Amino acid sequence: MSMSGEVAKEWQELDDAEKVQREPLLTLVKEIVPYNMAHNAEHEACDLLMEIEQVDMLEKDIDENAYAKVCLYLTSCVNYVPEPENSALLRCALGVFRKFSRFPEALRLALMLNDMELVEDIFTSCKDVVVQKQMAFMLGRHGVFLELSEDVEEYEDLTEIMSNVQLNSNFLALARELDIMEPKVPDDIYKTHLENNRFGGSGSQVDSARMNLASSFVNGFVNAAFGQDKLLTDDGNKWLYKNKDHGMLSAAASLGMILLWDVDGGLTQIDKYLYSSEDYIKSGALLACGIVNSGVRNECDPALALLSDYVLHNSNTMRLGSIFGLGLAYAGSNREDVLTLLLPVMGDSKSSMEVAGVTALACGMIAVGSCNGDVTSTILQTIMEKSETELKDTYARWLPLGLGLNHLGKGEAIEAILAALEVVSEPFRSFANTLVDVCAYAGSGNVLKVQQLLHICSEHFDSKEKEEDKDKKEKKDKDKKEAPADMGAHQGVAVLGIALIAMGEEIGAEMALRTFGHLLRYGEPTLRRAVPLALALISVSNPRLNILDTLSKFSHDADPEVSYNSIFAMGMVGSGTNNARLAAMLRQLAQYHAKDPNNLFMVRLAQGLTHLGKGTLTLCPYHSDRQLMSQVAVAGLLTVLVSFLDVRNIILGKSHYVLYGLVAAMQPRMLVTFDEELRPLPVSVRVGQAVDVV
Amino acid sequence: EEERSKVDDLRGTPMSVGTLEEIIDDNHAIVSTSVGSEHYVSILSFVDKDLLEPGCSVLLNHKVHAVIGVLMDDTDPLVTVMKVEKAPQETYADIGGLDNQIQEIKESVELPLTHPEYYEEMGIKPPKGVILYGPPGTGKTLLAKAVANQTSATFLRVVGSELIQKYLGDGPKLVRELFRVAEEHAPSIVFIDEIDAIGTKRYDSNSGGEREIQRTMLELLNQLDGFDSRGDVKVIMATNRIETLDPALIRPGRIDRKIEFPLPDEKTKKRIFQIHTSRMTLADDVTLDDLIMAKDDLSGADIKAICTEAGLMALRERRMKVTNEDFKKSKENVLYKKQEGTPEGLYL
């Protein structure tokens, strides 16, 4: 029309086509071009607001995309009867894709405020009600794929349209960086469960069909995999040759090659330090001396025979780390020892953990992939023989570590037989017992387990165990964002808030510093004692700046509890990387006059923060640790705990053979560390040796 | 408990706060309210008298001009200038083409702080920092190399400082009173950029003066000497000429090195313009070839806004969208030339 080319700037040229529509359709674009093409004229981009409607209903494309770059608004709502809307749109969906990538082979567009903003503004009404399958699948643009999805459970989003490996590499990469902000990640094949053949088949076919360049992520996956469930399901999903892949599987040659590789990059001193302690015979502590020979040798029988022969004296709990070394020696590769490992169980009525409960833990913890499947049914049958003498308390802590670890989705349920002894009703001992008892049975994930177990256990309710019982539901769902919704209660027991933020959020970035810092300032007193406990998880990103800074003020406090939770918060997550601040802090710590093990728990645990499974040959010298343990042991004088500290720094120091690192780069979580480490907070007598197993 | 409720009425309510004069070994404390007052207070506890030091503010109860307890307030106008903060979102990787030049300054400042293991085992240890400068207008572009140091621990951005020329403090201790308060919060970095003390030809305006102002600038000269320079408190200076510092100042430090920012060439122009347009998406119709080719020896900032002056006039035509009408008007700015000029003029 002639009004569009008028020199007058008076509004408006928009919406004018709605009043008279079919009549202007008799004309063509031939009248529109002289106004927009000629410069120094009024209404240059203003005429495009009327033109966008003319080219939209005519199905012409790349013309509407160019004329709508100025609008950015009327593109959303434009002429409403949905029948012309959804018709021309599906024609525009197939007509814009054919106008792009026609070179062929990119160059890529060229996110942007032109192409991406236009397809997103219309995508609103698309994702609202009608049709389906917008240009995100047709165009294949990975930038619009971030805006393609809508809020939904991601468990059903694991599937995707199959394509060539070329575009699949960019699709999996840009989706991974999208899923790091999202609860579920493409790496969830570890946790999930699932357990269907899908992840096993799709995991083995990513390297298909090449069997040569596939050495990575396959041969390197099976040797770094501690559980047999990974090497089991993948065995049926591994199609190379026939049936003879069992050699590299089963963790026989797998664990055997990496152990010799650790001796290569090793090794640990054997004859010098240990036989010097043999001249000192058995220490009066009867605490950390058992786990010494466990990881070291491995495999040698003579040092194993001296262990088993000495622990027949039955004295106290000393048998703990030693009998754990009986199985661990032969089981370093395979199978092993699982036959004679369970013999002392029924051969020693326990009547407690320190007598016959040690060897009962051996087959469970040293299993590491068994099942197999005899060990599962054997452990469940072995615990049915000893019930009233176990009973509900002391040994019920370690037993779940032998099932949920290897198989989280195991069909065998050990909870029903272990919950019949709950009638003891003792609120005190059940705290540290029922904490990981119901938690470490299985990873759950069905959401039906928390509902069942709560109805049968509570009944009523325990008024105490229900605290940790709800923490199992929080630990059940992994980083599913439901935990911030479960903290609205905030009971006076306060054990819920600390366990909720740590485990409830697992992500690359911290993001929890707003919630973690809020609960300590708003919380009641004595809650700040248990606040640092969350530093063992979210601090795996940057352990340097965040850990030692905040823990510098809490480490110098005279209170034993907050000083015990300070060095522990650093703990293992702070021992992954060395530093000069951790070494310089060691001074004045051993010179303190404070009594109780908390004084030496600070210093001696930080002595192992210089490295984990590194040295000594190759690399860092052991003479530095020998001079530090000798000079500090001349005080008090005994105080038998001075013989506990010199053997403590060599537990992880002289064992080596395992580089962790993290464990692990695959982002799992060790259930033996988080279990035991919560017990030393109300330390009494034997809760210290339970942590000594690690 | 009842402690806070019982002792709240002893000091107040309308109490006054003075300044501690001196400390006597007899436990008598002499407090001076403004102005010209004394007193004797005997208190054997709550001190904390060592952290105080004289010349500090302490409480005075109404009855009778006595201190209930000492607190650490303010402290001084100089400590406030450190915040805030900086630590921006920019990183050393956001600039390019200086990677060969920046690896010397980046590794020197990263030798302390992070990676201390090889720093402490050495036990020599060049914590001297560097000195920055360059043409035509750069030397704050070398501060963009410190934007990664700004994100590292605590940073202080300083141009001409404050107390140097304007009004003097007491001795070099101003930087050293910053060092003792930093030692709890350490590490830290104190930048120095574009010193205007000797940069101005005619000071504003006529003062006390053409002679003595050089002697109060000489106070700055001895303040940086310095007595006694030990740790860091990193010192990185940026200014035209280094010759203002006497050779006696170089003996305590800093003797490490000084770097110059050369004129970025066509490879550096395109790289600096690329990273700025990397995170924030650019336009495809604008080619980077004709921009870097038409210019010779220009910074990364100058190549930026010559495309802005095209987008400047672009909105007068009322286009938010990318339009080819600006492509010629941007190519016209390439034909406009004028990007660089400098004498010359001669035929050599």
PDB file of N, CA and C in Angstrom, chain A residues 145-200:
ATOM      1  N   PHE A 145      19.063 -27.116  21.347  1.00  0.00           N
ATOM      2  CA  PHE A 145      18.725 -28.304  22.123  1.00  0.00           C
ATOM      3  C   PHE A 145      18.655 -27.996  23.613  1.00  0.00           C
ATOM      4  N   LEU A 146      19.419 -27.002  24.074  1.00  0.00           N
ATOM      5  CA  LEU A 146      19.330 -26.589  25.471  1.00  0.00           C
ATOM      6  C   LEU A 146      17.960 -25.998  25.781  1.00  0.00           C
ATOM      7  N   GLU A 147      17.376 -25.281  24.825  1.00  0.00           N
ATOM      8  CA  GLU A 147      16.055 -24.689  24.977  1.00  0.00           C
ATOM      9  C   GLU A 147      14.945 -25.574  24.429  1.00  0.00           C
ATOM     10  N   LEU A 148      15.285 -26.728  23.850  1.00  0.00           N
ATOM     11  CA  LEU A 148      14.261 -27.638  23.348  1.00  0.00           C
ATOM     12  C   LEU A 148      13.530 -28.334  24.488  1.00  0.00           C
ATOM     13  N   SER A 149      14.271 -28.827  25.476  1.00  0.00           N
ATOM     14  CA  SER A 149      13.674 -29.611  26.542  1.00  0.00           C
ATOM     15  C   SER A 149      12.859 -28.727  27.483  1.00  0.00           C
ATOM     16  N   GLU A 150      11.926 -29.365  28.183  1.00  0.00           N
ATOM     17  CA  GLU A 150      11.110 -28.736  29.207  1.00  0.00           C
ATOM     18  C   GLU A 150      11.309 -29.493  30.512  1.00  0.00           C
ATOM     19  N   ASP A 151      10.903 -28.873  31.618  1.00  0.00           N
ATOM     20  CA  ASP A 151      11.125 -29.491  32.919  1.00  0.00           C
ATOM     21  C   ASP A 151      10.395 -30.825  32.995  1.00  0.00           C
ATOM     22  N   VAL A 152      11.160 -31.894  33.219  1.00  0.00           N
ATOM     23  CA  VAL A 152      10.615 -33.245  33.291  1.00  0.00           C
ATOM     24  C   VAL A 152      11.657 -34.113  33.977  1.00  0.00           C
ATOM     25  N   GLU A 153      11.235 -35.282  34.452  1.00  0.00           N
ATOM     26  CA  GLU A 153      12.192 -36.255  34.962  1.00  0.00           C
ATOM     27  C   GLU A 153      13.126 -36.700  33.842  1.00  0.00           C
ATOM     28  N   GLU A 154      14.431 -36.603  34.093  1.00  0.00           N
ATOM     29  CA  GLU A 154      15.426 -36.901  33.070  1.00  0.00           C
ATOM     30  C   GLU A 154      15.662 -38.396  32.892  1.00  0.00           C
ATOM     31  N   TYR A 155      15.080 -39.236  33.753  1.00  0.00           N
ATOM     32  CA  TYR A 155      15.278 -40.678  33.635  1.00  0.00           C
ATOM     33  C   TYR A 155      14.776 -41.208  32.298  1.00  0.00           C
ATOM     34  N   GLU A 156      13.751 -40.577  31.727  1.00  0.00           N
ATOM     35  CA  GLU A 156      13.241 -40.960  30.418  1.00  0.00           C
ATOM     36  C   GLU A 156      13.900 -40.195  29.277  1.00  0.00           C
ATOM     37  N   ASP A 157      14.793 -39.256  29.579  1.00  0.00           N
ATOM     38  CA  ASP A 157      15.476 -38.468  28.563  1.00  0.00           C
ATOM     39  C   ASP A 157      16.817 -39.062  28.148  1.00  0.00           C
ATOM     40  N   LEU A 158      17.188 -40.226  28.689  1.00  0.00           N
ATOM     41  CA  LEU A 158      18.470 -40.826  28.337  1.00  0.00           C
ATOM     42  C   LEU A 158      18.509 -41.255  26.877  1.00  0.00           C
ATOM     43  N   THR A 159      17.353 -41.549  26.288  1.00  0.00           N
ATOM     44  CA  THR A 159      17.294 -41.941  24.889  1.00  0.00           C
ATOM     45  C   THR A 159      17.403 -40.721  23.982  1.00  0.00           C
ATOM     46  N   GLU A 160      17.907 -40.950  22.771  1.00  0.00           N
ATOM     47  CA  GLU A 160      18.059 -39.887  21.791  1.00  0.00           C
ATOM     48  C   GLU A 160      18.010 -40.491  20.396  1.00  0.00           C
ATOM     49  N   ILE A 161      17.785 -39.629  19.405  1.00  0.00           N
ATOM     50  CA  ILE A 161      17.746 -40.075  18.018  1.00  0.00           C
ATOM     51  C   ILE A 161      19.143 -40.497  17.583  1.00  0.00           C
ATOM     52  N   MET A 162      19.241 -41.682  16.987  1.00  0.00           N
ATOM     53  CA  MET A 162      20.525 -42.208  16.551  1.00  0.00           C
ATOM     54  C   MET A 162      20.965 -41.538  15.256  1.00  0.00           C
ATOM     55  N   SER A 163      22.269 -41.303  15.138  1.00  0.00           N
ATOM     56  CA  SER A 163      22.840 -40.651  13.968  1.00  0.00           C
ATOM     57  C   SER A 163      24.283 -41.120  13.812  1.00  0.00           C
ATOM     58  N   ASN A 164      25.013 -40.476  12.906  1.00  0.00           N
ATOM     59  CA  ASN A 164      26.407 -40.822  12.678  1.00  0.00           C
ATOM     60  C   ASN A 164      27.257 -40.459  13.894  1.00  0.00           C
ATOM     61  N   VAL A 165      28.410 -41.124  14.002  1.00  0.00           N
ATOM     62  CA  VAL A 165      29.303 -40.898  15.136  1.00  0.00           C
ATOM     63  C   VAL A 165      29.849 -39.476  15.122  1.00  0.00           C
ATOM     64  N   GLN A 166      29.954 -38.869  13.938  1.00  0.00           N
ATOM     65  CA  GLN A 166      30.402 -37.483  13.836  1.00  0.00           C
ATOM     66  C   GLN A 166      29.509 -36.556  14.653  1.00  0.00           C
ATOM     67  N   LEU A 167      28.234 -36.450  14.269  1.00  0.00           N
ATOM     68  CA  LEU A 167      27.313 -35.584  14.999  1.00  0.00           C
ATOM     69  C   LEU A 167      27.037 -36.108  16.402  1.00  0.00           C
ATOM     70  N   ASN A 168      27.188 -37.418  16.618  1.00  0.00           N
ATOM     71  CA  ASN A 168      26.977 -37.973  17.951  1.00  0.00           C
ATOM     72  C   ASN A 168      28.058 -37.522  18.924  1.00  0.00           C
ATOM     73  N   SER A 169      29.277 -37.288  18.432  1.00  0.00           N
ATOM     74  CA  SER A 169      30.341 -36.802  19.303  1.00  0.00           C
ATOM     75  C   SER A 169      30.051 -35.387  19.790  1.00  0.00           C
ATOM     76  N   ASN A 170      29.556 -34.522  18.902  1.00  0.00           N
ATOM     77  CA  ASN A 170      29.195 -33.171  19.315  1.00  0.00           C
ATOM     78  C   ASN A 170      27.886 -33.154  20.093  1.00  0.00           C
ATOM     79  N   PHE A 171      26.991 -34.108  19.824  1.00  0.00           N
ATOM     80  CA  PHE A 171      25.739 -34.168  20.571  1.00  0.00           C
ATOM     81  C   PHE A 171      25.976 -34.609  22.009  1.00  0.00           C
ATOM     82  N   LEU A 172      26.837 -35.609  22.209  1.00  0.00           N
ATOM     83  CA  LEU A 172      27.129 -36.086  23.556  1.00  0.00           C
ATOM     84  C   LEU A 172      27.971 -35.092  24.345  1.00  0.00           C
ATOM     85  N   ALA A 173      28.820 -34.318  23.667  1.00  0.00           N
ATOM     86  CA  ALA A 173      29.678 -33.368  24.369  1.00  0.00           C
ATOM     87  C   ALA A 173      28.884 -32.160  24.851  1.00  0.00           C
ATOM     88  N   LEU A 174      28.076 -31.566  23.969  1.00  0.00           N
ATOM     89  CA  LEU A 174      27.309 -30.386  24.357  1.00  0.00           C
ATOM     90  C   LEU A 174      26.152 -30.745  25.283  1.00  0.00           C
ATOM     91  N   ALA A 175      25.708 -32.005  25.268  1.00  0.00           N
ATOM     92  CA  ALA A 175      24.701 -32.430  26.233  1.00  0.00           C
ATOM     93  C   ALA A 175      25.318 -32.692  27.599  1.00  0.00           C
ATOM     94  N   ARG A 176      26.593 -33.086  27.638  1.00  0.00           N
ATOM     95  CA  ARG A 176      27.258 -33.322  28.915  1.00  0.00           C
ATOM     96  C   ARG A 176      27.429 -32.023  29.690  1.00  0.00           C
ATOM     97  N   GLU A 177      27.924 -30.976  29.026  1.00  0.00           N
ATOM     98  CA  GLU A 177      28.033 -29.668  29.661  1.00  0.00           C
ATOM     99  C   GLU A 177      26.675 -29.062  29.983  1.00  0.00           C
ATOM    100  N   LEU A 178      25.604 -29.537  29.344  1.00  0.00           N
ATOM    101  CA  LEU A 178      24.258 -29.124  29.723  1.00  0.00           C
ATOM    102  C   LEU A 178      23.764 -29.872  30.954  1.00  0.00           C
ATOM    103  N   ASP A 179      24.179 -31.126  31.124  1.00  0.00           N
ATOM    104  CA  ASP A 179      23.699 -31.971  32.209  1.00  0.00           C
ATOM    105  C   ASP A 179      24.487 -31.805  33.502  1.00  0.00           C
ATOM    106  N   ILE A 180      25.575 -31.029  33.497  1.00  0.00           N
ATOM    107  CA  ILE A 180      26.315 -30.821  34.739  1.00  0.00           C
ATOM    108  C   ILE A 180      25.540 -29.908  35.679  1.00  0.00           C
ATOM    109  N   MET A 181      24.733 -28.998  35.132  1.00  0.00           N
ATOM    110  CA  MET A 181      23.874 -28.158  35.955  1.00  0.00           C
ATOM    111  C   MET A 181      22.606 -28.878  36.394  1.00  0.00           C
ATOM    112  N   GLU A 182      22.222 -29.954  35.687  1.00  0.00           N
ATOM    113  CA  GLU A 182      21.082 -30.843  35.844  1.00  0.00           C
ATOM    114  C   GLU A 182      21.434 -31.990  36.790  1.00  0.00           C
ATOM    115  N   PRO A 183      20.460 -32.490  37.559  1.00  0.00           N
ATOM    116  CA  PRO A 183      20.746 -33.623  38.456  1.00  0.00           C
ATOM    117  C   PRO A 183      21.378 -34.826  37.774  1.00  0.00           C
ATOM    118  N   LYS A 184      20.861 -35.247  36.624  1.00  0.00           N
ATOM    119  CA  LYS A 184      21.370 -36.431  35.946  1.00  0.00           C
ATOM    120  C   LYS A 184      22.409 -36.048  34.900  1.00  0.00           C
ATOM    121  N   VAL A 185      23.449 -36.864  34.796  1.00  0.00           N
ATOM    122  CA  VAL A 185      24.555 -36.619  33.874  1.00  0.00           C
ATOM    123  C   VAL A 185      24.684 -37.837  32.971  1.00  0.00           C
ATOM    124  N   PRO A 186      25.323 -37.686  31.807  1.00  0.00           N
ATOM    125  CA  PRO A 186      25.563 -38.859  30.948  1.00  0.00           C
ATOM    126  C   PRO A 186      26.415 -39.933  31.603  1.00  0.00           C
ATOM    127  N   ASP A 187      27.124 -39.611  32.682  1.00  0.00           N
ATOM    128  CA  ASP A 187      27.956 -40.567  33.400  1.00  0.00           C
ATOM    129  C   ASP A 187      27.175 -41.379  34.426  1.00  0.00           C
ATOM    130  N   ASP A 188      25.855 -41.194  34.504  1.00  0.00           N
ATOM    131  CA  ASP A 188      25.031 -41.879  35.495  1.00  0.00           C
ATOM    132  C   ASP A 188      24.987 -43.389  35.303  1.00  0.00           C
ATOM    133  N   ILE A 189      25.553 -43.913  34.210  1.00  0.00           N
ATOM    134  CA  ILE A 189      25.560 -45.357  33.980  1.00  0.00           C
ATOM    135  C   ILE A 189      26.230 -46.097  35.129  1.00  0.00           C
ATOM    136  N   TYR A 190      27.169 -45.445  35.816  1.00  0.00           N
ATOM    137  CA  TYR A 190      27.721 -46.009  37.044  1.00  0.00           C
ATOM    138  C   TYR A 190      26.631 -46.218  38.089  1.00  0.00           C
ATOM    139  N   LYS A 191      26.032 -45.122  38.564  1.00  0.00           N
ATOM    140  CA  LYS A 191      25.017 -45.209  39.610  1.00  0.00           C
ATOM    141  C   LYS A 191      23.806 -46.009  39.142  1.00  0.00           C
ATOM    142  N   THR A 192      23.176 -45.568  38.058  1.00  0.00           N
ATOM    143  CA  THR A 192      21.987 -46.230  37.529  1.00  0.00           C
ATOM    144  C   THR A 192      22.343 -47.593  36.931  1.00  0.00           C
ATOM    145  N   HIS A 193      21.569 -48.662  37.169  1.00  0.00           N
ATOM    146  CA  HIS A 193      20.322 -48.744  37.957  1.00  0.00           C
ATOM    147  C   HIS A 193      19.192 -47.762  37.592  1.00  0.00           C
ATOM    148  N   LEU A 194      18.532 -47.872  36.428  1.00  0.00           N
ATOM    149  CA  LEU A 194      18.795 -48.775  35.288  1.00  0.00           C
ATOM    150  C   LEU A 194      18.933 -50.270  35.598  1.00  0.00           C
ATOM    151  N   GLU A 195      20.122 -50.811  35.325  1.00  0.00           N
ATOM    152  CA  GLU A 195      20.504 -52.220  35.347  1.00  0.00           C
ATOM    153  C   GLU A 195      19.972 -52.967  34.127  1.00  0.00           C
ATOM    154  N   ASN A 196      19.178 -52.330  33.271  1.00  0.00           N
ATOM    155  CA  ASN A 196      18.741 -52.947  32.030  1.00  0.00           C
ATOM    156  C   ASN A 196      19.914 -53.098  31.064  1.00  0.00           C
ATOM    157  N   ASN A 197      19.724 -53.964  30.066  1.00  0.00           N
ATOM    158  CA  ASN A 197      20.759 -54.220  29.070  1.00  0.00           C
ATOM    159  C   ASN A 197      21.071 -52.999  28.209  1.00  0.00           C
ATOM    160  N   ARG A 198      20.305 -51.913  28.342  1.00  0.00           N
ATOM    161  CA  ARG A 198      20.489 -50.752  27.475  1.00  0.00           C
ATOM    162  C   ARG A 198      21.870 -50.129  27.653  1.00  0.00           C
ATOM    163  N   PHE A 199      22.240 -49.792  28.892  1.00  0.00           N
ATOM    164  CA  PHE A 199      23.515 -49.113  29.108  1.00  0.00           C
ATOM    165  C   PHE A 199      24.697 -50.033  28.827  1.00  0.00           C
ATOM    166  N   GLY A 200      24.512 -51.345  28.976  1.00  0.00           N
ATOM    167  CA  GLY A 200      25.585 -52.270  28.653  1.00  0.00           C
ATOM    168  C   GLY A 200      25.803 -52.407  27.158  1.00  0.00           C
TER     169      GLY A 200
END
